Every structure is written in C-alpha cells, then in structure tokens.
C-alpha cells in the first residue's frame, strides 16, 4: 500500500485550475477560485507496479464573458472520480452559460476548460508517479 503525493496535486491542480485561460471575449474564460481535491488519493506499489487510483472530489468555480456582453460564473465539480482514467473524460459537474447567453462558449469550455483539466492529469500522473517511483 503506497501513498500518492496528494500535496503535489492540489498545489498544481488548484493553481492549474486558477490558471484557466481566457481567449476571445466571444469565447473567453477566467478562474475565480478553486477549492482542491478533498479526499484520499493513493497509488499502488511503485518501481514498475505504480498505478494511480484516487478517491477524492474537487470543487472550483470560473467566470467567462460572451460576445453578447455578459459575464457568467459557472460551477465545476468532479466527485470521488479516480484519475485512473483520463481526467478530461472524467465526470465533471459543469454549470456555465446555462443561465446566461453564452451557450456556444460553454461548449468551447468543454474542449478548453474541462480540457485544461486534461492538463491536470498531466501533472497528477507525471509529477506524482514520476516522483513516487522516482522514474
């Protein structure tokens, strides 16, 4: 039973989450605050037996402006989903534009925002495992 570097993740995932970038006012995005994956993450033996099964949920929020001239702050929350799979293909609770006239934007955020989270897998998998098994 090996532990996963959880502290390494929050630090990056949270920041990376506060790193949500914006594009055109037509399809822009801006982070407003990130909680962090709260729960228990764990990896199996390392040195070639290293696998990533985590059980935690993260809660964050964002803000995006639409060419329409409206700002909207949606919700993004992924429950106890394990990164044993693609973070992006994971189950995320997205709630943006549904209340505002961005609609088209939330879609892009689907390929950019939840995608950015794809990057979260980039560090979680790389930073944690590369460090734990030390390569």
From Swiss-Prot:
The organism's place on the tree of life at top rank: Eukaryota
Cellular compartment(s): Cytoplasm, Cytosol; Endoplasmic reticulum
Stretches that traverse the bilayer: none
Swiss-Prot/TrEMBL induction comment: By heat shock and treatment with the HSP90 inhibitor 17-demethoxygeldanamycin (17AAG).
Organ and tissue specificity: Expressed in numerous tissues, including brain, heart, skeletal muscle and kidney and, at lower levels, liver and placenta.
Family per record: Belongs to the AHA1 family.
Function: Acts as a co-chaperone of HSP90AA1. Activates the ATPase activity of HSP90AA1 leading to increase in its chaperone activity. Competes with the inhibitory co-chaperone FNIP1 for binding to HSP90AA1, thereby providing a reciprocal regulatory mechanism for chaperoning of client proteins. Competes with the inhibitory co-chaperone TSC1 for binding to HSP90AA1, thereby providing a reciprocal regulatory mechanism for chaperoning of client proteins.
Subunit (UniProt): Interacts with HSPCA/HSP90. Interacts with HSP90AB1. Interacts with GCH1. Interacts with SRPK1. Interacts with FLCN.
Descriptive protein name: Activator of 90 kDa heat shock protein ATPase homolog 1
Protein source organism: Homo sapiens (Human)
Residues of the full protein shown: 28 to 162 of 338
């Amino acid at each position: 039973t090996e532990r996963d570097a959880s502290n390494w993740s929050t630090d990056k995932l949270k920041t990376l989450f506060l790193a949500v970038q914006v594009q055109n006012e037509e399809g822009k995005c801006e982070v407003t605050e990130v909680s962090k994956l709260d729960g228990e993450a764990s990896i199996n033996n390392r040195k070639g037996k290293l696998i990533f099964f985590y059980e935690w949920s993260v809660k964050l929020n964002w803000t995006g402006t639409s060419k329409s001239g409206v700002q909207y702050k949606g919700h993004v929350e992924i429950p106890n989903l394990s990164d044993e799979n693609s973070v992006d293909e994971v189950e995320i609770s997205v709630s943006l534009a549904k209340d505002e006239p961005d609609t088209n934007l939330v879609a892009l955020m689907k390929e950019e925002g939840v995608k950015l989270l794809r990057e979260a897998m980039g560090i979680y998998i790389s930073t944690l495992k590369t460090e734990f098994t030390q390569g």
